[PDB]
């Protein structure tokens, strides 16, 4: 009843006030369902650039909303919880980047998308887990500085054969610290299941999986693998996304993994956001201009 009210009022206010809702794959199912588009940060950013609308309600975490805003400076971007962020990303700082640039002056600074917008202004190129391998492959260098995620950096080193110098020391994602034993357990319980895990997972988990890929990659695997059952080693939000796309197959969480910050967004605070038209994502224009360069480098090296 209340969700029915909240859902209908959200759909009403989004229509009335000219907002497009963009939701990340890790949002709760109820917010994914009222979104105009659901996707990874790259898909959502690219999508934003194509919109005729000048108003965006973004449903994810701050670095993502800011990625949208940097590529769409003249659109009004709001979020329902202004504290939704990536705690581990904020362990990488400007001074660590400067320090490592000095020591390895010829190593391009490749920053993972979860990095703060301030940190992005000091990068040579941005990447996501979808494109990180391709991006580091096409750089001239045989050595790269990579942060903030150490597991993704080592994965990239593995697949490119390049030297990846990770920063900071011990940057990792709690959400993807799956037990390797959990894979052994599912392979006996579901013998024919395909295990897909995120490259942020530790090396023993990746190496025992049938596929390693980001959320965008995970959702393309059933387009080419006919298996009836997939075991999914990422954040719980992707199970709903996959089930919706491929109703014919079964998706089983490797374990329950919840990103607390992603779950800060609710139907209630989303409705408040459309009522009040807050909270606006504002970056100093200087940050937009400086962060935009390594982002455009990323597309140049992708496309
Ligand atoms: O690319 C994305 O949207 C992200 C993904 C993804 O796999 O799509 N995973 C983790 C983060 S922090 C962001
Ligand atoms: Fe995070
Ligand atoms: Fe993350
Ligand atoms: Fe993560
Ligand atoms: Fe997270
Ligand atoms: S995150
Ligand atoms: S992350
Ligand atoms: S994440
Ligand atoms: S997270």
8 Å CB contact between 262 and 26: yes
Helix (H, G, I), strand (E, B) or coil at 204: helix
CATH architecture label of 1-80+264-284: 3-Layer(aba) Sandwich (3.40)
Query: How many Cβ atoms from other residues are within 10 Å of residue 58's Cβ?
Result: 30
Question: Does this chain's domain 1-80+264-284 share its CATH topology with 173-256?
Answer: yes
Tokens of residue 187, six digits = 């392979």
Query: How many Cβ atoms from other residues are within 10 Å of residue 165's Cβ?
Result: 17
Rounded to a whole number of angstroms, the CA Rg of the chain reads: 19
CB-based neighbours (< 5 A) of ligand 2, an ion = 86
41 lines ligand 1 (CB under 6 A): yes
Contacts of 46 (CB under 8 A, 6+ apart): none
Residues forming the annotated binding site for [4Fe-4S] cluster?
86, 173, 259
8 Å CB contact between 211 and 232: no
8 Å CB contact between 147 and 137: no
Q: Report residues whose beta carbon is within 6 angstroms of any ligand 6 atom.
A: 61, 86, 114, 259
Helical spans, DSSP H, in the chain: 2-16, 29-34, 41-50, 62-71, 94-103, 117-120, 132-138, 150-160, 181-189, 203-207, 215-218, 237-245, 267-276, 285-302
Residue 23 backbone phi and psi in degrees, to 5:
-120, 135
175 lines ligand 8 (CB under 6 A): yes
Calculate the alpha carbon distances from 179 to 135, 206, 257, 262 in Å. 29, 11, 11, 22
CA pair distance 100, 232, nearest whole angstrom:
35
* Closest listed residue to residue 247, CA positions, set 225, 224, 222: 222
8 Å CB contact between 291 and 94: no
Tokens of residue 139, six digits = 């750089």
d(CA 112, ligand 3 centre) in Å: 10
Domain positions in the chain are: 1-80+264-284, 87-172, 173-256
- Neighbouring-strand partners of residue 166: 146
CA pair distance 273, 277, nearest whole angstrom:
5
CA pair distance 218, 232, nearest whole angstrom:
8
8 Å CB contact between 144 and 165: yes
For domain 173-256, say whether CATH 1.10.730.10 is its number.
Answer: no
On the 0-12 / 13-18 / 19+ scale of CB atoms within 10 A, 184 is exposed
CA pair distance 30, 8, nearest whole angstrom:
12
CATH architecture label of 87-172: 3-Layer(aba) Sandwich (3.40)
**PDB resolution in Å:** 2.1
DSSP string of 74-112, one letter each residue: TSEEE-S-TT---TTGGGS-HHHHHHHHHHSTTS-EEEE
Calculate the alpha carbon distances from 272 to 10, 63, 279 in Å. 9, 21, 10
8 Å CB contact between 136 and 162: yes
Query: How many Cβ atoms from other residues are within 10 Å of residue 174's Cβ?
Result: 12
Length of the chain: 303
Residues forming the annotated binding site for iminosuccinate?
24, 41, 112-114, 129, 198-200, 215
Helix (H, G, I), strand (E, B) or coil at 233: strand
């Amino acid at each position: 009843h209340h969700h029915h009210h909240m859902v209908d009022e959200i759909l009403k206010l989004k229509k009335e006030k000219g907002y497009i809702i963009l939701a990340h794959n890790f949002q709760i199912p109820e917010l994914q369902d009222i979104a105009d588009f659901v996707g990874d940060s790259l898909q959502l950013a690219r999508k934003a650039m194509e919109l005729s609308e000048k108003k965006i309600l973004f449903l994810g975490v701050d670095f993502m909303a800011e990625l949208v805003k940097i590529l769409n400076p003249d659109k009004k971007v709001i979020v329902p919880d202004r504290s939704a962020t990536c705690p581990m990303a904020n362990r990488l700082t400007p001074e660590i980047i400067r320090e490592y640039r000095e020591k390895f002056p010829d190593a391009p600074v490749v920053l993972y998308v979860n990095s703060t917008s301030e940190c992005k202004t000091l990068a040579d190129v941005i990447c996501t887990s979808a494109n990180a391998v391709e991006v580091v492959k096409k750089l001239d260098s045989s050595v790269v500085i990579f942060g903030p995620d150490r597991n993704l950096g080592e994965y990239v080193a593995e697949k490119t054969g390049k030297k990846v110098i990770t920063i900071p020391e011990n940057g990792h994602c709690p959400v993807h610290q799956f037990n390797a034993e959990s894979i052994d357990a599912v392979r006996k319980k579901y013998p024919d299941a395909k295990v897909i895990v995120h490259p942020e997972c530790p090396k023993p988990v990746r190496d025992k999986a049938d596929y390693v890929g980001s959320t965008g990659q995970m959702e393309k695997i059933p387009e080419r693998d006919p298996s009836r059952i997939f075991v999914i080693g990422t954040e719980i939000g992707m199970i709903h996304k996959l089930k919706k796309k491929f109703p014919d197959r079964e998706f089983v969480p490797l374990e329950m993994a919840v990103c607390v910050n992603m779950k800060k967004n609710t139907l209630e605070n989303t409705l408040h956001a459309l009522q009040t038209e807050s909270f606006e994502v504002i970056l100093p224009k200087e940050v937009i201009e400086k962060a935009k360069k390594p982002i455009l480098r990323m597309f140049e090296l992708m496309g």
